[PDB]
Amino acid sequence: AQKPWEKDAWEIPRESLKLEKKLGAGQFGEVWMATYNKHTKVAVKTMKPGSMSVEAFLAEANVMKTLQHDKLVKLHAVVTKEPIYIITEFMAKGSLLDFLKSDEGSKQPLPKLIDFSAQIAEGMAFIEQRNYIHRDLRAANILVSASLVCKIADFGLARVIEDNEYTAREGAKFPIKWTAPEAINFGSFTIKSDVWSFGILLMEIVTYGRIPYPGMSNPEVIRALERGYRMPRPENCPEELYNIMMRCWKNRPEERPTFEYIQSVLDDF
Numbered sequence: 001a002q003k004p005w006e007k008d009a010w011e012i013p014r015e016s017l018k019l020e021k022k023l024g025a026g027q028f029g030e031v032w033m034a035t036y037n038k039h040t041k042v043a044v045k046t047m048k049p050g051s052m053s054v055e056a057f058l059a060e061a062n063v064m065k066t067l068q069h070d071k072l073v074k075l076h077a078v079v080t081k082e083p084i085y086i087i088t089e090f091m092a093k094g095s096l097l098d099f100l101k102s103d104e105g106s107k108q109p110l111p112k113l114i115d116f117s118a119q120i121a122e123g124m125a126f127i128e129q130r131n132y133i134h135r136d137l138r139a140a141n142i143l144v145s146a147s148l149v150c151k152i153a154d155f156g157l158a159r160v161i162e163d164n165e166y167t168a169r170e171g172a173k174f175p176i177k178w179t180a181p182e183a184i185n186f187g188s189f190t191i192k193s194d195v196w197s198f199g200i201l202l203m204e205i206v207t208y209g210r211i212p213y214p215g216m217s218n219p220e221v222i223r224a225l226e227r228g229y230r231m232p233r234p235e236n237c238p239e240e241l242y243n244i245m246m247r248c249w250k251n252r253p254e255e256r257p258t259f260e261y262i263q264s265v266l267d268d269f
């Protein structure tokens, strides 16, 4: 059992970082662009003291220690005395959602969109293979590098899977338009419920960050899905890409495809 007062291999001294520019903020803290020991650009997430559990804030970095991959955002360090920091690689173009809604993201042609999709699929194939689930897959939680490599971020909800199902407690609420119906209705999270979110994420990419189910209410979405409705194919969406979405939105979790399969289809598009 680790002592509450002992540090680990990931710890760095606070003075090695110089926080240069605030990239964003929320109720739980801020994200800064920073340099580490002069020559190395990094990203820092700070926790707002009192906004949340310290142990939960830090638990995210523990997960990222385990889930290290080219297509997952890379943990470099932590600072575990208040103010509490998590340090990762810098991803110059920010979130995928904001990128696509920006001028540069808007100029990305279809082949690049499917490139982004394939990179994300690869990362999820790794999460699949490592017996984890993410549970918060969406464009907002993907980051994009200066050379246009997409990587999965936000591992706050990510969990190890024992025996192919995680069961959320009954009072858990999750972003409805992105969450698999069975996960919403009974708390049944599996890698197949991430497969569903990936379908929604595909739609986000091909629509340049447009919200899913535009103009529909959440209860309306839940009832539409039960009835068999699914989002229609956009103008710019190739049939083969929409058919993968549709496979990701099968009613029955076990009939949805594996991430390995999705990666390979998108790879060979």
Ligand SMILES: CCN(CC)CCNc1cc(Nc2cc(O)ccc2C)nc(-n2cnc3ccccc32)n1
Binding pocket: 023, 024, 031, 043, 044, 045, 060, 073, 086, 087, 088, 089, 090, 091, 092, 093, 094, 095, 140, 141, 142, 143, 153, 154, 155
């Ligand atoms: C993915 C978006 N969300 C939740 C919606 C997480 C917060 N935004 C972040 C996080 C991040 N790295 C990061 C990711 C984590 O999952 C945990 C800790 C950190 C530091 N880097 C960045 N980040 C890295 N380079 C950037 C350049 C511009 C804007 C943001 C940049 N942003």
